[PDB]
Design an enzyme around this catalytic site. Structure first.
Site, PDB file in Angstrom:
ATOM      1  N   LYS B  44       1.196  -0.960  -0.104  1.00 56.40           N
ATOM      2  CA  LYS B  44       0.195   0.450  -0.105  1.00 56.40           C
ATOM      3  C   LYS B  44       0.654   1.238  -0.136  1.00 56.40           C
ATOM      4  O   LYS B  44       0.834   2.387  -0.632  1.00 56.40           O
ATOM      5  CB  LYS B  44      -0.793  -0.012   1.325  1.00 56.40           C
ATOM      6  CG  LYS B  44      -1.510  -1.210   1.816  1.00 56.40           C
ATOM      7  CD  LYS B  44      -3.217  -0.804   2.182  1.00 56.40           C
ATOM      8  CE  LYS B  44      -3.463  -2.241   3.810  1.00 56.40           C
ATOM      9  NZ  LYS B  44      -4.857  -1.912   4.043  1.00 56.40           N
ATOM     10  N   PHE B  85      13.821  -2.530   5.317  1.00 58.12           N
ATOM     11  CA  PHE B  85      14.677  -2.947   6.491  1.00 58.12           C
ATOM     12  C   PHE B  85      13.919  -3.515   7.684  1.00 58.12           C
ATOM     13  O   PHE B  85      14.656  -4.887   7.855  1.00 58.12           O
ATOM     14  CB  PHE B  85      15.757  -2.101   6.603  1.00 58.12           C
ATOM     15  CG  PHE B  85      16.299  -2.159   8.146  1.00 58.12           C
ATOM     16  CD1 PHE B  85      17.558  -2.300   8.595  1.00 58.12           C
ATOM     17  CD2 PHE B  85      15.633  -1.565   9.613  1.00 58.12           C
ATOM     18  CE1 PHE B  85      18.106  -2.880   9.311  1.00 58.12           C
ATOM     19  CE2 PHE B  85      16.700  -1.548  10.514  1.00 58.12           C
ATOM     20  CZ  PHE B  85      17.865  -2.448  10.689  1.00 58.12           C
ATOM     21  N   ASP B  90      12.716  -8.543  10.534  1.00 58.76           N
ATOM     22  CA  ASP B  90      11.464  -9.021  11.439  1.00 58.76           C
ATOM     23  C   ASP B  90      10.934 -10.610  10.279  1.00 58.76           C
ATOM     24  O   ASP B  90      10.770 -11.684  11.593  1.00 58.76           O
ATOM     25  CB  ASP B  90      10.375  -9.017  11.491  1.00 58.76           C
ATOM     26  CG  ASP B  90       9.167  -9.246  12.082  1.00 58.76           C
ATOM     27  OD1 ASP B  90       9.099  -8.926  13.293  1.00 58.76           O
ATOM     28  OD2 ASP B  90       7.904  -9.373  11.326  1.00 58.76           O
ATOM     29  N   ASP B  94      10.444 -14.398  12.900  1.00 58.61           N
ATOM     30  CA  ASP B  94       9.399 -14.827  12.992  1.00 58.61           C
ATOM     31  C   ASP B  94       9.227 -15.916  12.860  1.00 58.61           C
ATOM     32  O   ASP B  94       7.801 -16.339  12.042  1.00 58.61           O
ATOM     33  CB  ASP B  94       8.684 -13.784  12.819  1.00 58.61           C
ATOM     34  CG  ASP B  94       8.631 -12.033  13.494  1.00 58.61           C
ATOM     35  OD1 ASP B  94       9.076 -12.674  15.027  1.00 58.61           O
ATOM     36  OD2 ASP B  94       7.831 -11.672  12.904  1.00 58.61           O
ATOM     37  N   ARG B  99       6.133 -12.616   2.079  1.00 64.22           N
ATOM     38  CA  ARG B  99       5.611 -11.608   2.850  1.00 64.22           C
ATOM     39  C   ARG B  99       5.207 -10.517   0.768  1.00 64.22           C
ATOM     40  O   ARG B  99       5.838 -10.880   0.192  1.00 64.22           O
ATOM     41  CB  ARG B  99       6.391 -10.851   3.110  1.00 64.22           C
ATOM     42  CG  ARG B  99       5.709  -9.235   3.369  1.00 64.22           C
ATOM     43  CD  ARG B  99       7.146  -8.325   4.469  1.00 64.22           C
ATOM     44  NE  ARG B  99       7.256  -8.841   5.363  1.00 64.22           N
ATOM     45  CZ  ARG B  99       6.726  -8.237   6.580  1.00 64.22           C
ATOM     46  NH1 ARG B  99       5.446  -7.725   6.770  1.00 64.22           N
ATOM     47  NH2 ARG B  99       6.470  -9.471   7.535  1.00 64.22           N
ATOM     48  N   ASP B 161       8.962  -8.443  21.754  1.00 62.03           N
ATOM     49  CA  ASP B 161       8.693  -9.233  20.963  1.00 62.03           C
ATOM     50  C   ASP B 161       8.843 -10.652  20.783  1.00 62.03           C
ATOM     51  O   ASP B 161       8.603 -11.335  20.848  1.00 62.03           O
ATOM     52  CB  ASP B 161       8.567  -8.775  19.984  1.00 62.03           C
ATOM     53  CG  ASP B 161       7.336  -9.525  18.731  1.00 62.03           C
ATOM     54  OD1 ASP B 161       8.234 -10.304  18.458  1.00 62.03           O
ATOM     55  OD2 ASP B 161       5.677  -9.816  18.853  1.00 62.03           O
ATOM     56  N   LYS B 185       7.416  -1.475  19.069  1.00 54.66           N
ATOM     57  CA  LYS B 185       7.921  -2.682  17.830  1.00 54.66           C
ATOM     58  C   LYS B 185       6.663  -1.951  15.784  1.00 54.66           C
ATOM     59  O   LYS B 185       7.511  -1.244  15.429  1.00 54.66           O
ATOM     60  CB  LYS B 185       7.810  -3.214  17.844  1.00 54.66           C
ATOM     61  CG  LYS B 185       6.038  -3.994  17.850  1.00 54.66           C
ATOM     62  CD  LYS B 185       6.151  -5.491  17.525  1.00 54.66           C
ATOM     63  CE  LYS B 185       4.878  -5.695  17.243  1.00 54.66           C
ATOM     64  NZ  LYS B 185       4.372  -7.307  16.750  1.00 54.66           N
ATOM     65  N   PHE B 224      -3.685  -0.365  15.024  1.00 56.66           N
ATOM     66  CA  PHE B 224      -3.774  -0.527  13.771  1.00 56.66           C
ATOM     67  C   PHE B 224      -2.125  -1.720  13.933  1.00 56.66           C
ATOM     68  O   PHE B 224      -2.622  -3.407  13.587  1.00 56.66           O
ATOM     69  CB  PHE B 224      -1.950   0.436  13.109  1.00 56.66           C
ATOM     70  CG  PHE B 224      -1.385  -0.633  11.930  1.00 56.66           C
ATOM     71  CD1 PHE B 224      -1.702   0.081  10.959  1.00 56.66           C
ATOM     72  CD2 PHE B 224      -0.292  -0.384  11.617  1.00 56.66           C
ATOM     73  CE1 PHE B 224      -1.546  -0.608   9.686  1.00 56.66           C
ATOM     74  CE2 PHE B 224      -0.021  -0.819  11.337  1.00 56.66           C
ATOM     75  CZ  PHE B 224      -0.454  -1.033   9.589  1.00 56.66           C
ATOM     76  N   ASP B 228      -3.149  -5.493  12.782  1.00 62.28           N
ATOM     77  CA  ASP B 228      -2.435  -6.286  12.764  1.00 62.28           C
ATOM     78  C   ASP B 228      -2.357  -7.948  12.925  1.00 62.28           C
ATOM     79  O   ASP B 228      -2.269  -8.961  12.044  1.00 62.28           O
ATOM     80  CB  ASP B 228      -0.791  -6.035  12.753  1.00 62.28           C
ATOM     81  CG  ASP B 228       0.213  -7.138  11.880  1.00 62.28           C
ATOM     82  OD1 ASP B 228       0.555  -6.299  10.372  1.00 62.28           O
ATOM     83  OD2 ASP B 228       0.940  -7.945  12.888  1.00 62.28           O
ATOM     84  N   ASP B 229      -2.529  -7.987  14.309  1.00 67.88           N
ATOM     85  CA  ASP B 229      -2.097  -9.083  14.950  1.00 67.88           C
ATOM     86  C   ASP B 229      -3.744 -10.558  14.440  1.00 67.88           C
ATOM     87  O   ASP B 229      -4.003 -11.205  14.370  1.00 67.88           O
ATOM     88  CB  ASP B 229      -2.449  -9.246  16.364  1.00 67.88           C
ATOM     89  CG  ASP B 229      -1.036  -8.373  17.369  1.00 67.88           C
ATOM     90  OD1 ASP B 229      -0.092  -8.724  16.516  1.00 67.88           O
ATOM     91  OD2 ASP B 229      -1.144  -8.396  18.331  1.00 67.88           O
TER      92      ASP B 229
END
Ligand SMILES: C[n+]1ccccc1CC(P(=O)(O)O)P(=O)(O)O
Ligand SMILES: C[n+]1ccccc1CC(P(=O)(O)O)P(=O)(O)O
Ligand SMILES: [Mg+2]
Ligand SMILES: [Mg+2]
Ligand SMILES: [Mg+2]
Ligand SMILES: [Mg+2]
Ligand SMILES: [Mg+2]
Ligand SMILES: [Mg+2]
Lengths: 341, 338
Positions: B44, B85, B90, B94, B99, B161, B185, B224, B228-229
């Protein structure tokens, strides 16, 4: 000595990092970062940090040196040490290393793993808080911040050359040339190891003349090539109990000075043994390479090239303007010539 | 608008090369161009656009020129590089696979863990762009400092996290922990940064206004991240572009914290048995628990309550911080599904 004097300020640098950042608000992270920094900065020679302090002390007029300016040169030196610590935390991951400074590499610790990649960013970011805290109101502030970012770009250019999966395709070592080697070491080592600490010294001493910075840079880049050729030799031939680290250049198929020189001297049949055995973690393969290096007399070549390069650097240092302190550079060359770790 | 933002990208990439030592090393210049193109493609461009919108709505219309709009887009691209970056790293931590509908950069065979070096090249790029466009301007050091501070904040939150529950001890999965995670984060680099960059370009320096802006941004950023979660668990991969990992990674997500608030004694044991496991049946059992505890219905309602609270705050801002900007930002994300 100069080393304990330089180390004396470390506990105060740690506090500065905390107090000047949002770390003040999250003690879990402030405490973790203290552990990260103590582990990753512990031991070793502190050679980058000393070079910064030595440079300042040799380049500034003795009448302009104060206790505050010495604490500032030590602080700049420690920012280089922290850069190094960040660089090597990531290098160890990419190089498949197991030990450094005689203990497990940070990423190898079970509590850490791949989260080392975040610890590295916490380290790097620390530098800028130190620089801002001490220098934000000075004329040299933007020069400092730019220098540290340029050092990151240079180093990562050289790391790319070093680790790229491109550098070799199986039995094709056609890229293992001195042209490639010279680029790799120029960027991955020579900038942050010599150019950065010397330039930080010069800035602190209010030397700004572009011609003097260019001459100092040229000298630094020659010394750093030399330094990395020694690092590469030590990877193969160094005593782990002194170096603190198990070498991985052979297993990782690195474009090391030894590999480049071995290719210069291989017979046709020896080139097949090289290509068969290099880049393998099998112990019989690694040993076969080491045997080959011995058969090709690379130790003797190294001793002679270390001296020839030494003599050349010393002459270069003698030909620098007195404003750049020939004596600084001679002493830097001397401190590393014949090192075994 | 988005395509007028995307038009500026080739000049950014060109600056990165010519303004650095990359001009001497075409092997690396060419590589970095690939790194940037792959990691900045699609999506986006939301953080970039926030920067542009923030400047355009905060600055007086009489002061906006074609040249300040270009600079605003330039700073928005620096935020997009920063985000590139951050998520490169991440995704390593994770255990992510995709992505933006393609493999994560570290998952490519020729990259692997050398993605940590590509991340440094990206980060460092930012500063060459800032130098190229801003070096002779009064705001230069403020811009360089905001990007550095964003790295520190982000990494602080990432530490919270990724740091190593203990087995079936979920005592730290609390709202206090959650709030700290997502403040550091997400909220700083996703909203405070782009809004602060717009404020700086529009010559707004009053520290009370920077504070009020920051407080609003932090509340939006928490919101936000809750969305996301939710999307990690419930979103459609063909829209989000990404396979979710929060459950198998034992994350302190909004959903997990809410599940703990609701679990019966026996549900708690189901939760501690199955959370944090890569086994498909265990993952599906956590999703079935989430359903039974009515977490989808709670998210719908909480999203709405938070939205209403956000809008009430925005309406209450000083006129010089543009309540409209904030209303606009909130509306751009409320009810999103990716
Ligand atoms: C010398 N250097 C420059 C850049 C990054 C890392 C290093 C560390 C060395 P090291 O692992 O031998 O300490 P390299 O991996 O052989 O180059
Ligand atoms: C939102 N964010 C903030 C900081 C670093 C990385 C991200 C990406 C997300 P994403 O992996 O869901 O896109 P998170 O891992 O759930 O937090
Ligand atoms: Mg190494
Ligand atoms: Mg290396
Ligand atoms: Mg080495
Ligand atoms: Mg993630
Ligand atoms: Mg994450
Ligand atoms: Mg997520």
């Amino acid at each position: 000595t100069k080393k304990e004097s330089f180390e004396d300020v470390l506990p105060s640098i740690l506090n500065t990092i905390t107090t000047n950042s949002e770390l003040t608000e999250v003690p879990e992270v402030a405490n973790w970062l203290k552990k990260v920094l103590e582990y990753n900065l512990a031991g070793g020679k502190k050679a980058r940090g000393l070079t910064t302090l030595f440079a300042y002390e040799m380049l500034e007029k003795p009448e302009n040196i104060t206790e505050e300016t010495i604490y500032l040169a030590k602080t700049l030196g420690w920012c280089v040490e922290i850069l190094q610590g960040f660089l090597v935390m990531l290098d160890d991951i990419m190089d498949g290393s197991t030990t450094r400074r005689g203990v497990p590499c940070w990423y190898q610790l079970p509590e850490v793993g791949l989260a080392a990649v975040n610890d590295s960013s916490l380290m790097f970011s620390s530098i800028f808080y130190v620089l801002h805290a001490h220098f934000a109101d000075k004329k040299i502030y933007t020069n400092l911040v730019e220098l540290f970012n340029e050092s990151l770009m240079h180093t990562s250019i050289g790391q790319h050359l070093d680790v790229t999966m491109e550098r070799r395709q199986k039995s094709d070592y056609s890229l293992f040339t001195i042209e490639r080697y010279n680029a790799i070491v120029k960027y991955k080592t020579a900038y942050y190891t010599y150019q950065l600490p010397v330039c930080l010294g010069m800035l602190l001493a209010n030397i700004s003349d572009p011609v003097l910075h260019q001459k100092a840079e040229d000298m630094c880049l020659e010394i750093g090539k030399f330094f990395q050729i020694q690092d590469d030799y030590i990877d193969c031939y160094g005593d782990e109990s002194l170096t603190g680290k198990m070498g991985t250049d052979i297993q990782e198929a690195k474009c090391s000075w030894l590999a480049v020189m071995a290719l210069q001297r291989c017979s046709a049949s020896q080139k097949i043994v090289f290509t068969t055995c290099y880049g393998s973690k099998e112990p019989a393969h690694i040993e076969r390479i080491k045997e080959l290096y011995k058969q090709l007399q690379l130790p003797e070549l190294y001793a002679q090239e270390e001296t020839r390069m030494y003599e050349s650097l010393i002459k270069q240092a003698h030909g620098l303007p007195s404003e750049l302190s020939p004596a600084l550079f001679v002493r830097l060359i001397h401190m590393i010539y014949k090192r075994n770790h």
